[PDB]
Amino acid sequence: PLVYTPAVRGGANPASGSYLLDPQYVNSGVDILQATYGYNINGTANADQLLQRDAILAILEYALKDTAFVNAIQAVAAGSGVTTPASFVSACVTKLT
Amino acid sequence: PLVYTPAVRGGANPASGSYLLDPQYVNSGVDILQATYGYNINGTANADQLLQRDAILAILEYALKDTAFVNAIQAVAAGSGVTTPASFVSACVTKLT
Amino acid sequence: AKLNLAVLNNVFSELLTQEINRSATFLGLLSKYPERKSNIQWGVGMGGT
Amino acid sequence: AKLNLAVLNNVFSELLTQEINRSATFLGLLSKYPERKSNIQWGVGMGGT
DSSP, rough: OOOOOOSSSSSSSSSSBBOOOOOOOOOOSSOOOOOBBBBBBSSOOOOTHHHHHHHHHHHHHSSSOOTTTTHHHEEEEEEESSTTSSSHHHHHHOOOO | OOOOOOOSSSSSSSSSOOOOOOOOOSSSSSSSSOOOOOOOOSSSOOOTTHHHHHHHHHOOOOOOOHHHHHHHHHHHHHTTOOOOOOTTTTTTTOOOO | OOTTTTTTTTTOOSSOOSSOOOOOOOGSSSSSOOSSSSOOOOOOOOOOO | OOOSSSOOOOOOOOOOOOOOOOOOOTTGGGGOOOOOOSSSOOOOOOOOO
């Protein structure tokens, strides 16, 4: 089971719900994201969408910054038939299951 | 091979480099993302990083919005060895190889 | 390497668009009255003679 | 639904701090001269008598 905290240090669960991400340098070199993350704006998170929010913030903080995950997602895009990237994500969901 | 273009419609490649991501609704319900993506800041090209940036935007414009990808990355986080998520991002790389 | 690619800021503008429809027409012409009682009682007269 | 959640603007403050070392210490005291000529010729007196 995953145990997780928001990665920015003094701003874990904000009052307004606008969880400002700290910027990471993504391509191992040369870029930057500076994202945010708004909390519940179209309802609430009903005890299962906390687990999806538990994994979106992990794939956005500790995964795009890594150099072996961006190289693992590079090699899927250079595969066979992975064109028009609504099929790139459907060729990645078959590897994760 | 993959032929991704920047999915933000009017303004794929900007002059400044602050490629402003379009806001997207990530849990298929309730949250919002609102990223940016600053271009070259510690180098220019490397002729490999243009293919890795071709996949960072694909996993961020399309994949987090998708409802079948997020239920797959939810299932990896519930594993028997997934805590302190440097092991979460390493137990998904071996899924992608 | 741009010298203000990370200091430029994102500012909105005063252009809030009212999108939702919350109208009240039939409430707007019923000739309201302040009844401070428990229940309204009046008389209805039928026939019989 | 939060009211002004996704419409918040962020503003960077007026606090640029330069955090490198650029300094011409030795160049700042060499008593600079201009010279519009091709090369610098002078005489060096050795011995010999």
